[PDB]
Design a binder for this molecule. Structure first.
Ligand SMILES: CC(=O)N[C@H]1[C@@H](OP(=O)(O)OP(=O)(O)OC[C@H]2O[C@@H](n3ccc(=O)[nH]c3=O)[C@H](O)[C@@H]2O)O[C@H](CO)[C@@H](O)[C@@H]1O
Ligand SMILES: CC(=O)N[C@H]1[C@@H](OP(=O)(O)OP(=O)(O)OC[C@H]2O[C@@H](n3ccc(=O)[nH]c3=O)[C@H](O)[C@@H]2O)O[C@H](CO)[C@@H](O)[C@@H]1O
Ligand SMILES: CCCCCCCCCCCCCCCC(=O)O
Ligand SMILES: CCCCCCCCCCCCCCCC(=O)O
Ligand SMILES: CCCCCCCCCCCCCCCC(=O)O
Lengths: 346, 346, 345
């Protein structure tokens, strides 16, 4: 650990500063809690209401937000870039990451003869690499994880401990899979028999995880019966998420924790799926669609914008619906007020 | 380019299935009925496709006898089966993508098996799996890499346990059972003794989890053991991924619980029940035979009669359809009062 | 093994408890109060179950002194206790069904322990568990098979970790803590900066996860680490299966989170709070001490006073209960508007 002054911090960040440049800083903290020795940031408007009174010895602020608060006696770090990224730079100054302590390929790691392991890879204890698997260069295979038969882990990916990647899975470049996640599990499909009974079907389709994808903890992705399941590049998936068989997740999308997409559904590019939300099967989510948390998308969405509720309706339309449902006592009163002036006899 | 090429007749004889049309027709893959080309094999599956069979350019269509008789006059290559068209199709599919194992045959040396545990003939135990005291693994079983077969736990013949499954102590697994990676079977139930004003004290659960024949359990699904009673999944039932089965829950025969749904404690589910994805079911209630819950259903009382159910709380489909409608048509109902209120005379 | 039968009297002595009914009454197991036959011991702890008491053919009923006084006139075999009837029932439960361990005592040959890690006394580490650099295993801990104790992470005394648990790096586990199988403690939190292109950049999370004393965590539950600050779960709190705890979430003392519930980033849950199954609580909000949230609740804003809440969005029990009732009433309501328009002549 070390200390940086406000002027000394500015040059390292390549950021213009305003205020008392001798302010000494020894850590990092959020805007609502930071002490004089702490550094902070502001990127949003529904956050700026806490800036007026903040002890922080350094505040990272954009050129836009700086305009509304520049006169205030606070110490500033004014940047034309995202205040959040500039803030991470400051975070990575103070805390250092730590690995397991088992570098390279651990003697325990069982690797199948026919598997191809590239140069500069780390395989932690008790990991199992199956037949004809291809672990790329500069990859990390976490402790106890499983790389399935004929599966490919593209270069620079990071598999965390105890992860099951099943047979025939394409993992892209620099993909990060959190611990406990399962890729290429069987899709929930059965033969609906005549006595009402359910007969298993071996799903054999590929699961393709493209470059720059992130998969959260214990998230499960199902493979199709014989066609592909795809999570297109730059998409970020959170914890405990369900991706059904033959789902296509479009590029640079986000699926928040505990959300679920049902079988054979196309999610478009730059789509946000809120937490605990549920999108049903055989439907299409248009590009740039934002779901609220706990949304039931039952029909296909065919235009961008903010959606929410069960079923899915535009934000404007549910925000009005909720505030009109809340209005039902008052509306009934107006009926009682009207059923009072029906004492009309003559 | 595909794996293999068959004639219509050659393939028909391989399947032990009658054919109609050009027996010489070359067939080199499979496809969905509405996409299949000449080289492709497909199946008509009783549901739709009346007009979509007529205009199908497939080189082979797997059809039931009852349905071939109806489409007898059509100019198509038919593979007529007495079994399920889809089930036959599976065999066909498996000729073009042959299913693959991890490439570790037999019982791997790195498998820890308790001296007391009994392992039957022709079983396969993959690397790093653990078989605890007095466990009983039936013949033709598969224990996936680094899975745990708990103390006094039994696994019926021909059952397939995938990698990193935990089967706790005192859990009974039927024959032909398939468990996807990372399921937890026999975890403690969420029940406690309250004491010292709201403080919760651990209760040891000593009930069993009884999984019956031909049952499937999805990936990272968790099934809790009872306090003293048992948690039972009856014959042929299919539980998807990320499902939660609480302590002392009973699921009847040939029932389906889709991904991310949860049943609370001491609740009985009937036979031929479909529990929609993400749906929730309260504890100490009953779900009758042949009940179907839509996704995200919140069941708060018992359901005694069959049919389709939706909403939170759950009500018979038609009712919640009628509700969403009326709720949506609230502004129209308000203008119906507002303009009616405008009539204010004498 | 245990076709074990005890007399009502024998049991009463072991229980150190007052009784009513024939001493010789032979009891050979436990059963729930609705179903209990003459062979069986059962308990009445919950007042919703006082119904099944009147017609009970049970061989023995564990009961509080107050409930006995109330149902005194009944001719049933009573075991009368001043403690929790459920706890006393637990003592019987264990007499018939003895618990069991894996059968691999102490530190198993096949465990991997990084030389720099510290292992205390009377600790059990099961087959193929991995303990990473500079970890600390408290005295009399249980590490389940194939469990990972990540770097610089510490596990307190008498803590019980079940098989295939991932404790990621820099995670503090308190004393007595029990973690069910498949749990992930200390995964990276969900945080990205979206570029003026639509592309999402990975923000590295360096914060800890602090699990306090007597905390329990359910199967396949995931608790994320903060970006800089910590995610804390305080004393006594019990978390169920399949639960999401986002980065920088603080959970209070003696709080309960039922299965499949979720808490978004940087939210503080107070003490003695119940979060119903599958409930969802947004980020950057606070939940007051002594708050119950019904299952499937969608909490979109801070709850600042104690009570029972429900629905999506969340409103206090009273109001939501009315709201649902009035939505139920809609068809009847507009029929009154129809008869209103009927008279216009
Ligand atoms: C979440 C859960 O799992 N159970 C809740 C349920 O408890 P509940 O009283 O239903 O008991 P639990 O469901 O917790 O325990 C399971 C077994 O206890 C048996 N039993 C319970 C009480 C009794 O006096 N006699 C008896 O035999 C039930 O028949 C059942 O078979 O509602 C109570 C509040 O109303 C809560 O305290 C519990 O957290
Ligand atoms: C509730 C929720 O879903 N939050 C997420 C959301 O909110 P948001 O964009 O606000 O990010 P967060 O604020 O949650 O980031 C984590 C920390 O940043 C602090 N903070 C935030 C804004 C600000 O102007 N100054 C400040 O100091 C917060 O107090 C918090 O402790 O998108 C972020 C990506 O950018 C994620 O990292 C957040 O976790
Ligand atoms: C007759 C079944 C009920 C119909 C509604 C169920 C489909 C909606 C699913 C909600 C989203 C959850 C995604 C999980 C589905 C899956 O993995 O199979
Ligand atoms: C507090 C009661 C609210 C009403 C409940 C209706 C919605 C059902 C949701 C049940 C959650 C299912 C998860 C299993 C719970 C458990 O493990 O005990
Ligand atoms: C009709 C629905 C309205 C209710 C929506 C509010 C519910 C909020 C749910 C958010 C909790 C999800 C937890 C995910 C954790 C994470 O973000 O990483």
């Amino acid at each position: 650990q070390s200390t940086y002054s406000l002027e000394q911090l500015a040059d390292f960040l390549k950021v213009e500063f305003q205020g008392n440049g001798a302010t000494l800083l020894s850590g990092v903290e959020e805007i609502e809690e930071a002490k004089t020795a702490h550094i902070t940031f502001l990127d949003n408007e529904k956050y700026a209401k806490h800036l007026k009174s903040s002890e922080a010895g350094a505040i990272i602020i954009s050129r836009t937000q700086f305009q509304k608060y520049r006169d205030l006696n606070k110490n500033f770090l004014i940047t034309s870039e995202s205040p959040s990224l500039v803030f991470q730079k400051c975070l990575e100054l103070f805390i250092t990451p730590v690995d397991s302590g088992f570098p390279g390929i651990h003697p325990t790691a069982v690797i199948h003869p026919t598997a191809i392991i590239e140069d500069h890879v780390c395989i932690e204890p008790y990991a199992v690499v199956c037949q004809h698997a291809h672990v790329g260069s500069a990859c990390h295979i976490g402790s106890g994880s499983v790389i399935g038969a004929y599966s490919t882990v593209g270069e620079h990916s990071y598999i965390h401990p105890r992860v099951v990647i099943r047979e025939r899975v394409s993992i892209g470049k620099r993909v990060i899979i959190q611990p406990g996640a399962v890729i290429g599990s069987c899709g929930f499909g059965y033969v609906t028999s005549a006595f009402g009974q359910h007969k298993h079907l071996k799903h054999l389709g590929k699961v393709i995880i493209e470059d720059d994808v992130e998969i959260g903890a214990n998230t499960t992705i199902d493979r199709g019966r014989f066609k592909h399941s795809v999570v297109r590049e730059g998409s970020k998936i959170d914890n405990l998420v369900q991706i059904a068989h033959q789902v296509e997740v479009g590029q640079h999308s986000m699926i928040v924790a505990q959300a679920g997409i049902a079988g054979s559904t196309k999610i478009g590019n730059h789509v946000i799926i809120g937490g605990q939300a549920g999108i049903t099967g055989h439907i299409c989510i248009a590009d740039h669609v934002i779901m609220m948390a706990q949304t039931g998308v039952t029909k296909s969405i065919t235009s961008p914008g903010i959606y929410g509720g069960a079923p899915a309706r535009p934000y404007q339309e549910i925000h009005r619906q909720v505030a009109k449902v809340r209005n039902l006592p008052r509306l009934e009163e107006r009926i009682a007020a009207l059923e009072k002036l029906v004492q009309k006899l003559e």
